[PDB]
Design a protein around this ligand. Structure first.
Ligand SMILES: CC(=O)SCCNC(=O)CCNC(=O)[C@H](O)C(C)(C)COP(=O)(O)OP(=O)(O)OC[C@H]1O[C@@H](n2cnc3c(N)ncnc32)[C@H](O)[C@@H]1OP(=O)(O)O
Ligand SMILES: CC(=O)SCCNC(=O)CCNC(=O)[C@H](O)C(C)(C)COP(=O)(O)OP(=O)(O)OC[C@H]1O[C@@H](n2cnc3c(N)ncnc32)[C@H](O)[C@@H]1OP(=O)(O)O
Lengths: 197, 197
């Protein structure tokens, strides 16, 4: 239904975006088949995000489309194939009514001990199913990398499930290196509460 | 030379710890045999650390020993073996002249979108050779975990080398889980410089 060219906008999320973000987090949990592990609510986003200045704590960028600290990034995209979005009314942008929310990225600063320099870690990057494969995920990730470089970051890092070959190829298509020697350790739930001096 | 019991103190690093932190980071890089990729200087530490409130950005806790917000953790430690430290004079603590700096831990907040809660990520944790194998590294790790639970962190995370099976065993014994499917991706150097919109 959406044909030709679209105008993509990447912009800083505000508290008004909390419901769209909760919806996109839920969709992302389904994609990773971890919907049971996802307990996100809008109140939890209000309690944990927008506490610190952007790029100084957990920060979210929204990706929205329409047709024709961080300033919004606006780029035109020629659609690879027409877009059939049967959920556009549920993703209407709260900022500009005539935009459709199709994605988000959540990231926060990290630190390299050997560089003695801060960087950025991308925790989540998601684009709604009808909008994948036409350059939108690239714009969104490139927007974070762009601001990170403006803030003199040494590295930009993120994780990847080794079976998400679609994301692997996408990430390596941007010059990133998938490191094979590192494993994440997580202490949480009962074990975290039981861990004591 | 050092026998019986020592008093171990874990405290927040201040900018006065930068010379010891840089020495300890060089020792850590030397241990992991990545000293050429290690460009840490005290000036870099002064430019990247102690800029945000502790536990709100990259934070270092110092571990020191003697023989008799974050409040210091002071614990008595029974020495499993006599300790001979010839680097003692080079690691005299600023906080107290009679204390010896034996280690450090660097960590920063992270964020879980599935929990919609901030957590903590431990980037590096090091203890000097003469003081290993007597419980000090465990006190350092549990000191970060204890503060993370007090700040109601959802998770506490770190990375491990996949071949370091002894570390996987110890972390598993603590209740931590080594995730099998996650890989770290890194965008740095010329690829980071070329990544543009
Ligand atoms: C921990 C995490 O969050 S991992 C993040 C990944 N998330 C997921 O896997 C969830 C579901 N997937 C998605 O949301 C998305 O598909 C993403 C985020 C992986 C990528 O977003 P997309 O919009 O699909 O990517 P985009 O279209 O920009 O680029 C992907 C491919 O298109 C190519 N491409 C780049 N620019 C364009 C363009 N203008 N037009 C068409 N294709 C393009 C890239 O070279 C890349 O090629 P490859 O995958 O064949 O190697
Ligand atoms: C959490 C992290 O990021 S640790 C990863 C970096 N660790 C390194 O390998 C750097 C060099 N090693 C060291 O500085 C230390 O030996 C540390 C930091 C691993 C802690 O060791 P200790 O002070 O000896 O631990 P402690 O005496 O409390 O525990 C007994 C044993 O438990 C294990 N253990 C304790 N803490 C750790 C840890 N953080 N990682 C892996 N194994 C550990 C070790 O096998 C240790 O014996 P070791 O000193 O002979 O290696």
């Amino acid at each position: 239904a959406m044909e030709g060219t679209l105008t993509a906008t990447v912009r800083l999320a505000t508290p008004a975006d909390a419901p769209s973000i909760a919806k996109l987090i839920r969709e992302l949990a389904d994609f990773e088949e971890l919907s049971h592990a996802c307990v996100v609510t809008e109140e939890k986003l209000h309690s944990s995000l927008w506490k610190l200045p952007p790029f100084q704590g957990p920060t979210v960028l929204m990706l929205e489309v329409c047709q024709q600290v961080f300033e919004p990034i606006v780029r035109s995209v020629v659609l690879k194939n027409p877009i059939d979005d049967s959920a556009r009314e549920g993703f209407r942008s709260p900022s500009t009514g005539t935009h459709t929310t199709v994605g988000f990225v959540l990231f926060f600063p990290n630190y390299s001990t050997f560089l003695a320099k801060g960087g950025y870690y991308i925790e989540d990057l998601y684009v709604r199913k009808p909008y994948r494969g036409t350059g939108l995920g690239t714009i969104l990730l490139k927007s974070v990398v762009q601001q990170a470089k403006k803030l003199r970051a040494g590295r930009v890092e993120w994780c990847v499930l080794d079976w998400n070959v679609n994301a692997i190829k996408f990430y390596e298509g941007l010059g990133a290196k998938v490191m094979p020697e590192w494993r994440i350790c997580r202490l949480t739930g009962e074990a975290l509460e039981a861990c004591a001096l």
